[PDB]
Structure 1
Amino acid sequence: SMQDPIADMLTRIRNGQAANKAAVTMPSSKLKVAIANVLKEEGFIEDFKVEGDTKPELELTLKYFQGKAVVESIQRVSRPGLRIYKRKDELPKVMAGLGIAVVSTSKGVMTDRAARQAGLGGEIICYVA
């Protein structure tokens, strides 16, 4: 069944991106919306919207550069079968800092960089480069 909708989100991005799709859409959720926010703010997607009230559909506008996908890799780290948590001084960095790790903290979802600078650790949701 559909027991990890975040992996599903990652994957819908990854596959539509690989399929040079202009956009991708998925059932929404606050947690997805919090991740989409980080992606956009770090320039991995154009923009996003959620539409509807009772059955909210979230939509991500993908991004391309040299007839290439801006998103090179996008992988699930922590997951329902194996939760991954890190401390502030243990926070991974992707591509030596060129990519990012999405981290969920007591102060909401942010990048490894952000959480690092704010003295926090959290659940490592994914890597993106």
Structure 2
Amino acid sequence: SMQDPIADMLTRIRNGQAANKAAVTMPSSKLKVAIANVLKEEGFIEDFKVEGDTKPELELTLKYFQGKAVVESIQRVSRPGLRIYKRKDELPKVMAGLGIAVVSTSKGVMTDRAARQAGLGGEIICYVA
């Protein structure tokens, strides 16, 4: 069963990028949104909109540069049954910098680069390059 909602969101994105799917939907949630946000603010998805009133959705549109998708590689990290918490000086550098590491800090869900400078650490989430 859905023991890990995040993984689904992540997997759904890449599965689409390959199927050239315009966008993708799914049941939204606080975290799901936050993550999707950083994905847009960082340049991996055109935009996104959570539909549904009582039952929230998430119109997440996949972005594509040229003859290929923007998301070349995206995987989970701090998955359940095996969490991962790094220090303000442990934050990993995805794709030597050309990538991003979504980390949940005590100040919100930001990126490794951002969080690092801010001087705060947190729990990684994925390595969207």
TM-score if structure 1 supplies the norm length? 0.98
Query: What does the per-residue CA deviation read over 1:26-56, in whole Å, with 9 as the maximum and x for residues that have no partner?
Result: 1000101000110000000000000112110
**Unmatched 5+ stretches in structure 2:** none
Query: What does the per-residue CA deviation read over 1:42-76, in whole Å, with 9 as the maximum and x for residues that have no partner?
Result: 00000000011211001111111122000000000
User: Which stretches of structure 1, 4 residues or longer, exceed 4 Å deviation after superposition?
Assistant: none
Q: Report the Cα distance in structure 2 between the residues aligned to 1:48 and 1:75, rounded to whole angstroms.
A: 20
For the residue of structure 2 that corresponds to 1:125, the secondary structure is strand
Q: Report the Cα distance in structure 1 between the residues aligned to 2:84 and 2:59, rounded to whole angstroms.
A: 27
Q: Which residue of 2 aligns with 1:51?
A: 51
Equivalent residues in 2 for 1:12-91, closer than 5 Å: 12-91=12-91
**Unmatched 5+ stretches in structure 1:** none
Give the drift of 1:81. Answer: 1.4
Q: Report the Cα distance in structure 1 between the residues aligned to 2:101 and 2:62, rounded to whole angstroms.
A: 19
Give the drift of 1:117. Answer: 1.0
Q: Report the Cα distance in structure 1 between the residues aligned to 2:78 and 2:7, rounded to whole angstroms.
A: 10
For the residue of structure 1 that corresponds to 2:123, the secondary structure is strand
For the residue of structure 1 that corresponds to 2:66, the secondary structure is coil
Q: Report the Cα distance in structure 2 between the residues aligned to 1:8 and 1:113, rounded to whole angstroms.
A: 25
For the residue of structure 2 that corresponds to 1:60, the secondary structure is strand
RMSD, aligned α-carbons: 0.6
Matched length:
129
User: Greater strand share, 1 or 2?
Assistant: 1
Give the drift of 1:125. Answer: 0.4
Percent identity, aligned pairs only, is 100
